Amino acid sequence: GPAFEFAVAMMKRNSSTVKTEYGEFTMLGIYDRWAVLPRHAKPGPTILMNDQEVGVLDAKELVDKDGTNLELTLLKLNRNEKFRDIRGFLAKEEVEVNEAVLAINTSKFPNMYIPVGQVTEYGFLNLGGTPTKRMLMYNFPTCGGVLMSTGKVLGIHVGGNGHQGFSAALLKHYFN
Numbered sequence: 001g002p003a004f005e006f007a008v009a010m011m012k013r014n015s016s017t018v019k020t021e022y023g024e025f026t027m028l029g030i031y032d033r034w035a036v037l038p039r040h041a042k043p044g045p046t047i048l049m050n051d052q053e054v055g056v057l058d059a060k061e062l063v064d065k066d067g068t069n070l071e072l073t074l075l076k077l078n079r080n081e082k083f084r085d086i087r088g089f090l091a092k093e094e095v096e097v098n099e100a101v102l103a104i105n106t107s108k109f110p111n112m113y114i115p116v117g118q119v120t121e122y123g124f125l126n127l128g129g130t131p132t133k134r135m136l137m138y139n140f141p142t143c144g145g146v147l148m149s150t151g152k153v154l155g156i157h158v159g160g161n162g163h164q165g166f167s168a169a170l171l172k173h174y175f176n
Contacts, residue, residue, distance in 0.1 A: 114140070
């Protein structure tokens, strides 16, 4: 219940629906006009944010230092309003919890919340025939959804299959 209350509030304040030429995704603004998208969103020079066109001044396809894929794309946007800073909600390293909620805010899954239970650091994973690290795991039957628990933003949903879902851990240092 507390994780749900925290998630609804966090999504109202920092999330938006984004449309790229590759689909509709949930986007979470982090600080300034720096936001994060699942890598597969493949944002172009402009995106649509809540049905209105916005420019992208920069995009960084995050990688660890053995060059490995982390499956997240940081994007700097061209707009005036700034994101309520949520870096203090981001852990320093992969978080494991016993009760997490996955929140989605697009059109196929509008203001939807999924209880996914315990989340455990999964580590290395060959996601798309692509080597990937910093993966978090939870059971998830059947995006860019935001994985949260009470007072914590854990990661961004990037994949899964039938019974397990995977999120890229959203770490504090990716943002300074």
